[PDB]
């Protein structure tokens, strides 16, 4: 006999199923099925050119052009350097770090765990496994900001009272005025952003 075989996937069916999912490269066409886009290495992200994207204090275009901060490993992002994060600063009036940072992924990453093998030549194997909930891009960036910035604050207390003191503040306006009036240099830019 002949019957109109039910289509395994319906367009309205997928629209409802993805209510919970907000992933551009991941969709669930079926109840348990998943249609995905193949992975590409991020070293090619340099080849993108466009206008800046100003979300709070973060410039996503510079993140696309960034090389140090695009690593998928959580430890390599939580242990990075301020000079790398200083490239992503387009504040223009942002009061809080968190308000700027809320424009970053909150999903867990993968982290590289290393374990010994216990052989005659002792060697360690490192493998990437999905991290727990507390290891996300936002958390890694927050840790990087707070740990490195403390190293910058304690290292720029020209005044004895501290970074927040009015005299140290005055020295800061002096320095930034000097760099604004002077010709721009990447040393000057990195100090300014930090």
């Amino acid at each position: 006999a002949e019957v109109d075989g039910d289509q395994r996937i319906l367009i309205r069916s997928l629209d409802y199923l993805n209510n919970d999912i907000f992933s551009l490269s991941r969709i669930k066409v079926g109840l348990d099925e998943f249609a995905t886009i193949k992975k590409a290495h991020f070293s090619k992200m340099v080849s993108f050119e466009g206008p800046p994207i100003k979300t709070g204090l973060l410039d996503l275009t510079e993140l696309m052009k960034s090389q140090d901060l695009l690593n998928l490993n959580y430890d390599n992002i939580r242990n990075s350097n301020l000079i790398s994060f200083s490239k992503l600063i387009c504040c223009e009036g942002s009061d809080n770090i968190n308000d700027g940072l809320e424009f970053l992924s909150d999903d867990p990453m993968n982290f590289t765990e290393g374990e010994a093998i216990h052989s005659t030549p002792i060697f360690n194997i490192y493998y990437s496994k999905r991290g727990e909930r507390h290891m996300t891009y936002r958390n890694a960036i927050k840790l990087l900001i707070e740990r490195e910035t403390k190293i910058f604050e304690e290292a720029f207390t020209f005044s004895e009272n501290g970074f927040i003191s009015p005299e140290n503040l005055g020295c800061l306006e002096a320095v930034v005025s000097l760099i604004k009036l002077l010709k721009t240099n990447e040393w000057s830019t990195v100090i300014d952003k930090c």
Partner: peptide, 30 residues
């Protein structure tokens, strides 16, 4: 401090060089 000791010195030296090529009390007063 080792991470910023070079960067700050280079920044100051380049600013001195630029301002020369163009041609304490300060903290207390602020």
């Amino acid at each position: 401090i080792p991470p910023w000791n070079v960067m700050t010195e280079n920044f100051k030296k380049k600013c001195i060089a630029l301002i020369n090529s163009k041609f304490s009390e300060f903290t207390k007063l602020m």
